[PDB]
Subunit: 336 residues, 4 copies
């Protein structure tokens, strides 16, 4: 059990208990961290226009992601090597997701195997985040493992031909196959739409393009037969000076013309952030850093607590805005 | 008698004399308090365009609220359990309103009975703020008591299906029928326009919808036969990230097409704030926190002093803007 | 002779040598001082678009105010009771204006008589600032004295039916006929366009309306046969929350359609401020507080130094913007 | 070899090792330094819209400046008297440019002769920055020396009829022919388009107009047969309150209608700044202060390190934005 009542409290506690180099690795954005600040600031510029007297006695937060039911439109995003935050790492995370009835996106650079996570969370909704590695044999092996171990989708990260320049990591230096050296050597900078065609042919699993920021790229992902877009700037860790994901979301929703689900990550810290993303047409949002702060506090119980805080904040935001369920969250609730 | 010459001085004095938990309860907004800051910041963005050489020798501040004459378009808003600020609580407040010739809105969660307040301020203009409680029998009893004890209107609060998440109250924990537990258990989250129809049938008293932020909700309140709209975000204590009330006011005034009076609360601290609200079409404004700071300073004399400061600031703002009376305050005085 | 090289240096020195109550009286704006900050901030939002390769070898700063030649479009504005800043007060100021070849506007609430100032600066361009006092006999006497003693215009202040609420003056409490009490008792709040008609009939001297912020009021001043508009918010000391004078200037210039000269005061501290005001169509600007800071430093020599700093800054701003004289300063030099 | 990993680190190190008066001379902008702050802030307002899945395995940074190949669109701008920063001054700078395969613009107020710099960097791409001095004989001699010693262009500075007012230089006081006195006496304030005609007739070398901020001036430079425009506010050291160069660039690119190359300097500190300038139509950018900070750290090795940091940041920005070469950097990558 100190008393942590919002996501910011979990971050402040994590700073107090993590070694500075580990806290800095988790916290940091690219270069001058303009986008890191904007992912949060942009949510505040979108104002809520709540409806009164709707009857919100029995708020229902449940929705579906790529045809699978979830308890809430708030899911765990991929964050590499969770065992740095807590000894149980990804196993703690999947156990919390199982408890909450939400989905976990497992990093393909995890400190737990695809099989181990599936064995720890057999009833959990689980997706695999994938890089198309220079080694296409190990890429293929991960997708086959995901299929065999009951994972329900592939999130292919498309914004990382190279790793971003996070200054604190350079100052501090530095389980399915840790230093930026070895990761940089593994990731293929040549990845093209031809490689998306190869991945689409490799699996019948739903594939989501993670890291799209342009309407024209979203349209190309639909044309390649992908099943969703995760509007993401990689938590502002790749190219600094890109827009906030909440500011780009409306463009992407407009561009895909309802053909695939659109998701958002980047800067989600509060229930009102979730409400604004759904009002602008996202099906669900993903959280990265909040999950790591949960792990740092108390492993599985810490992740469960973070997810329960976001769930309760989202329920209250829905109720106060006059929304009894996610289907009645509409564009007129928000204006910038 | 320290020397307090503006409303901010009263707040700073209240911080110095109140226990931190009580000051924090009064001061706080919801969650990250974005709207709390914006209720004040938004007034500064509206600029005044004063007329010169009008003859403002005999400035007349008097107006009417729902057909009842008042000395100034500045009235006391509902604030629960005033006896926390001063031993005399609501009785101090109503005695000050009687002295000033303005109206008092009594919280239905007051530390003085409807009868006690009416006995302390028999000549005061008095209104009852109402929640539609899960217990409709006690709701009915309050309205009947208001009628019998010479209250002139019902302000039905419509923005509180649940209580907002004020973080300091969670950190500090915690007379007509005190802990958020007991209040949360009393308030009905199922309240709908059907319950407004029931209230409209229950009383011939004028009814004002308190907490409307959307033009479409304002139009529905007119269609239900209500007699006014109080444009309010509950002092930024309910849903955080809603607009400032002064920014929403023009939309609501436009939407009701002169069919009912429109009032404002939220962030009123200065005479120029009152002038801007009337220029944008509000009939009168309500003050919440300033009254509590008055009580904390010196009970009845403190409330009288706060109200006299706002009156004098408003008279000077009117005179310097070329307005001899409230009927000549027009839209051309302000631009954002 | 410390080394003061810009107007801000003179203010910082004045703070160091004046009693706090006197510094605060000079520095202060009305209420929360929003307009005080904006008079300066607004100049920074107007950006300069300099022309290159014009030939600025022999920059000529000279212009005319109401038909009288001046060395530069930078004149001394009225500031009451200059003897608080320096023993020589208004006599020091007029001697500096005589040296510079610019005009002095004498406050009608001066610590030197109209005759004394005329005797100290017989060759100086001198104007009288006038309030229409409740006592019209003493108002008439001031205008007749101005005429007899070789003053070239009347600036009638029209934004002061009452004195503004400057909070520091209230905290600190407190020669042609000192406490706000006595000044408040002297100034007529009934002044109307009828009183402007009376003043226009009283003198053939040029009359400038000082304190106009609306185009419609500027047009009425032209219709009443006045000879100029001084766009002024009284150094942000009257109604707080009015716009910056530089932001209102274009509206007023447009409204008078070239029929009378338009002047500006409020926030002029730098040569680029003068250039921006002339680019937006002002004939000349007036400085209030900078002159008091000059007096506080070294009386006549201090005022001369402040005026010489503004002159040199303005010459450099003209030269770097490609303007050899004031007639070639045009609207295309600035954009907001 | 402290560990400096970005340009800001080099500045902070230079502040620690340079005498305050020298650091202040290098750092300072004109007057209140509004433009100094805006040259940097303006880059942050331009947001990047990266393309994904392009194949950026073999990023090629090479381009051409005025027909000469360079390794990257990042060149060294003219900064007077580099020997104040390091004993080797301009010879250190040209040796670093030779190593990098980029161009050096040599100040005509250098602490090394045109011949000495050419002898130190015989293989380096070298340009001469020129003032048209009151002494046209020495102006002619510099151009003839540039021609003879294998310099490939003249950058004629057109924004300096007089030197800007940098306040710190006034507080601190103070090799082809040091005090502002002697420089002020040398520079001709009469320079006109007639003098540009004279310079165009004097040399067949390409001539770039350095310091243009207006589209109409850019068009006149094209009409006079000049070969490029360097959009520059002289590192915010001349007229304060001009726009940021990145904000003026689109106007200038539009105005010249592809007739000549357009370059930018002012506020370039990061690879994303270079990318934004090229996306808005600049051929290349110049850096001033970063080179001086390199010299202050470790002479030639320090300049090489600064240039290598900008090169690597630019390569990563190109790769993450989906640009394999400079020819595919287009207007759709940026929005303000
Ligand atoms: C420490 C850390 C590790 C991450 N690792 C990965 C990863 O392995 N794969 C991936 O696609 N994204 C990764 N991301 C990006 C996240 O999936 C996600 O886009 C981001 O955290 C969302 O922003 P938020 O942290 O503001 O919630 C990582 C982010 C962080 C902070
Ligand atoms: C301490 C406190 C108690 C309040 N209690 C009530 C209440 O019982 N009923 C109600 O309708 N509104 C209540 N409000 C909201 C106020 O009526 C009013 O909308 C708000 O205070 C106006 O904003 P201001 O405080 O900035 O003037 C309360 C506000 C505060 C700060
Ligand atoms: C201390 C002080 C005294 C003033 N006295 C007068 C006055 O007697 N009459 C008047 O018309 N304006 C008066 N003003 C307003 C000034 O004439 C002028 O509008 C203002 O100072 C311009 O702004 P600035 O101080 O930013 O230059 C006064 C201003 C100050 C600061
Ligand atoms: C210390 C210093 C000396 C300079 N000397 C010259 C010069 O001799 N000639 C010239 O044309 N520009 C000169 N400049 C302006 C630069 O060429 C260039 O426009 C400016 O430094 C670009 O901005 P940045 O410093 O933000 O990169 C100088 C700038 C600085 C900071
Ligand atoms: C003091 N620490 C822990 C430290 N300093 O630098 C590093 C570090 C540097 C590079 C890579 C890793 C871990 N592996 C991966 C693998 C794939 C990824 N995709 N996105 C990210 C991301 O961090 O945004 C990824 C990280 C690191 O842990 N760690
Ligand atoms: C340390 N104190 C005094 C503390 N901490 O938490 C609480 C508290 C929490 C919940 C409720 C109350 C009081 N009752 C009500 C009743 C109706 C209301 N309508 N609006 C409000 C509001 O506060 O905005 C209302 C408050 C409280 O006093 N008090
Ligand atoms: C500690 N001091 C010096 C102090 N505190 O309060 C006061 C004071 C208060 C009221 C009036 C005066 C002086 N008389 C006038 C007369 C006409 C004016 N027109 N504009 C102004 C202005 O100040 O903006 C005027 C001031 C004061 O000096 N002085
Ligand atoms: C403590 N130092 C070094 C100091 N204080 O003032 C000065 C100084 C003042 C004036 C001139 C110089 C050097 N000569 C030149 C020559 C041509 C130039 N073109 N642009 C600039 C610029 O600085 O922006 C130029 C500077 C100075 O070094 N130096």
């Amino acid at each position: 059990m100190p008393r942590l009542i919002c996501i910011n409290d979990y971050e402040q506690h994590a700073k107090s208990v993590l070694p500075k180099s580990i806290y800095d690795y988790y916290r940091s954005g690219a270069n001058d961290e303009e986008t890191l600040a904007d992912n949060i600031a942009a949510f505040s510029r979108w104002k809520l226009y709540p409806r009164m007297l709707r009857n919100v006695a029995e708020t229902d937060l449940s929705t579906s992601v790529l045809g699978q039911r979830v308890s809430m439109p708030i899911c765990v995003g991929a964050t590499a090597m969770q065992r740095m935050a807590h000894v149980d790492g990804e196993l703690a995370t999947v156990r919390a997701c199982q408890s909450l009835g939400t989905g976990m996106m497992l990093s393909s650079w995890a400190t737990s195997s695809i099989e181990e996570v599936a064995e720890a969370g057999p009833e959990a909704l689980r997706w695999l985040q994938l890089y198309i590695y220079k080694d296409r044999e190990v890429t293929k092996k991960l997708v086959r493992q995901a299929e065999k171990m009951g994972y329900k989708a592939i999130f292919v990260t498309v914004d990382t031909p190279y790793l971003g320049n996070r200054l604190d990591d350079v100052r501090n230096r530095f389980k399915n196959f840790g230093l930026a050296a070895y990761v940089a050597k593994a990731i293929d900078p040549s990845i093209s739409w031809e490689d998306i065609k190869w991945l689409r042919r490799l699996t019948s699993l739903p594939i989501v393009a993670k890291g799209i920021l342009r309407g024209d790229d979203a349209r190309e992902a639909v044309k390649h037969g992908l099943n969703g877009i995760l509007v993401s700037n990689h938590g502002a860790r790749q190219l600094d000076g890109v827009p906030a994901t909440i500011d780009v979301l409306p463009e992407i929703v407009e561009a895909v013309e309802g053909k695939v689900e659109v998701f958002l990550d980047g800067g989600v810290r509060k229930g009102t952030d979730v409400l604004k993303a759904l009002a602008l047409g996202a099906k669900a949002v993903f959280v990265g850093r909040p999950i790591v702060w949960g792990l740092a506090f108390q492993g599985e119980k810490g992740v469960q607590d973070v997810l329960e805080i976001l769930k309760e904040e989202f329920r209250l935001a829905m109720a106060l805005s006059g929304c009894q369920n996610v289907k009645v969250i509409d564009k007129t609730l928000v204006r910038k």
